[PDB]
Amino acid sequence: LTIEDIHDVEELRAVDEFRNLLVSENLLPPTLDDYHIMLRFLKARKFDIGKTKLMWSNMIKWRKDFGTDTIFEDFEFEEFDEVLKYYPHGYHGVDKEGRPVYIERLGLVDPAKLMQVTTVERFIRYHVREFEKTVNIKLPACCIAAKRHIDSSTTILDVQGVGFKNFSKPARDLIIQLQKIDNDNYPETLHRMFIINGGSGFKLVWATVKQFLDPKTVTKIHVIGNKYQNKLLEIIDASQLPDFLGGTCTCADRGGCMRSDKGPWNDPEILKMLQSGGPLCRHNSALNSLE
Ligand SMILES: CCCCCCCCCCCCCCCC(=O)OC[C@H](COP(=O)([O-])O)OC(=O)CCCCCCCCCCCCCCC
């Protein structure tokens, strides 16, 4: 099965130079020996091979120290269902370019009740486990459904009712900690973000958060007020967009759109193409063939 995966010659040179440096210093586990993983790290450091090797080396140590490589095996987040009740978030379908749509209803987050049911350390470990699913299962599924290389998401943050008066230091510090893990270990995995239902109270939340955010990430973020429905329908088909955001989806037989995890990674035929199907990338296939 042929997947549209255009490789730039300049990037082909840069990525293979970077890979040879990683191999020569025993920094390349075969589980991370993918053109596209290495390209995301190079892009995050503007193809500076010295800074990228440091970034890569810190990520390897991080995965060793955090236990990321055994997190599927090791971590059972048994409070999951309770957390969802006070933190509504999920993947739901794809945008018109085939990227997964990730939603959070931050207006419906109950900070007090969330800290009764979980800890910040556990929520972060859960976040890392979901990212491992996102890069190993959900994004490759999207590659197959679109017949096109996909490795980044469209995110919607619903911030209805969120104002600066009740924007707390722990809320801010969690965002910083999540972004640090994401920038350090999962770079170039956000395509764009739409922050919707921002009231006048949100203006200072956005002001303060921008002070800590990676500036390339800020350039990918669009903050919208209450009239957001048409902008989302421009970039997401109505069938892939929950009705409460202006689409036609209800996921009625699956507990509503926020609990369905709807997307091509729920399709058994697409999942079968991931587990025991051709390699998705013709350069990895060529490298693995040659070696
Ligand atoms: C009371 C609610 C507070 C409202 C907060 C206001 C938010 C302000 C805007 C946030 C800036 C986000 C920066 C860019 C985020 C980014 O790159 O990551 C997007 C990810 C999902 O990534 P992907 O896999 O979809 O690509 O998506 C994420 O995971 C990022 C979203 C940020 C997490 C929000 C956490 C809010 C804090 C919860 C409060 C409860 C804890 C209180 C403890 C006493």
Ligand code: NI
């Ligand atoms: Ni739905």
Ligand code: NI
């Ligand atoms: Ni490729």
